[PDB]
Ligand binder design. Structure first.
Ligand SMILES: CCNc1ccc(C#N)cn1
Length: 284
């Protein structure tokens, strides 16, 4: 029974290696990674691979791994797929821990924009969780943390992390991670999966997929939002993505909105993440 080696980048940046039978479905690998992680609340997470166009794809747990990675290496990342709007409602502290690690990467990468003060506050909770109580012995006037807190580090940011860290004495790691999440969950781009597209006029927009629905970012001042309940059908055809927007009260007809994606695979990927978010956040 022939087995393929799998390499998974975990959220702490380390590498997990395991073997699965070469005809395995994605769920098989996902279950192995989740067991390694002692993760029970698995519904929020998934595995990502890079396609031949170097695009991030979700590994479909129902489909064969070989029919997804195709010509590429069996290399994956472990990621948050569905960002919970209220992390306090997760049953386990370890779930909240993996969610914090994902968000720290969302912040450092610049996917999740964040004010100076919130970067410093999130940083201070991470430091409290991981080192415990502030100690002056480790931190002089010239201290720079090993921890990555932001897309661009400044001395002023390091200083503010320490000032806030001092305020958190006696805080336990679960408590500090819960405070991290209470702040992160409020950020306007929390759990927003962005897709480059063009509107029906050819104007360049971003489509955001998240818990609260589909967001259209047009020109900073013009941001349209379609709550999942207002979306009856999600479709794609060639390079085009379509949503059916339910009739308003006393309107005779459903309204259709049309977008141009860079290519046919980008249109299918956007369709599938929308359907998955619609299902997930209809049930949650
Ligand atoms: C960890 C991020 N992984 C992702 C994100 C978006 C999509 C899509 N579409 C696939 N994988």
């Amino acid at each position: 029974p022939k087995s393929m080696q799998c390499k998974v980048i975990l959220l702490d940046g380390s590498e997990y290696t395991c073997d699965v039978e070469k005809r395995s479905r994605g769920q098989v690998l996902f279950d192995k990674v989740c067991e390694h992680l002692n993760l029970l609340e698995k519904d929020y997470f998934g595995l990502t691979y890079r396609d031949a166009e170097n695009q991030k794809n979700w590994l479909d747990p129902a489909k064969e791994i070989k029919k997804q990675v195709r010509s590429g290496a069996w290399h994956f990342s472990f990621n948050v797929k569905f960002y919970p709007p209220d992390p306090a409602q997760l049953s386990e502290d370890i779930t909240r821990y993996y969610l914090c690690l994902q968000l720290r990467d969302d912040i450092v990468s610049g996917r999740l924009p964040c004010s100076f003060v919130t970067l410093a506050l999130l940083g201070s909770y991470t430091v409290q969780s991981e080192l415990g109580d502030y100690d002056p012995d480790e931190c002089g006037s010239d201290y720079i943390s090993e921890f990555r807190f932001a897309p661009n580090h400044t001395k002023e940011l390091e200083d503010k992390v320490i000032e806030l860290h001092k305020s958190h004495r006696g805080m336990t790691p679960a408590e500090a991670e819960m405070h991290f999440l209470e702040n992160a969950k409020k950020l306007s781009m929390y759990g927003v999966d962005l897709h480059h597209a063009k509107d029906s006029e050819g104007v360049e927009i971003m489509l955001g997929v998240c818990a609260s629905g589909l967001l259209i970012y047009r020109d900073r001042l013009r941001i349209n939002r379609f709550a999942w309940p207002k979306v009856l059908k999600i479709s794609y055809k060639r390079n085009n993505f379509y949503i059916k927007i339910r009739p308003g009260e006393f309107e005779q007809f459903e309204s259709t909105i049309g977008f141009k994606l860079p290519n046919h695979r980008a249109a299918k990927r956007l369709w599938k993440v929308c359907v998955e978010h619609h299902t997930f956040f209809r049930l949650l």
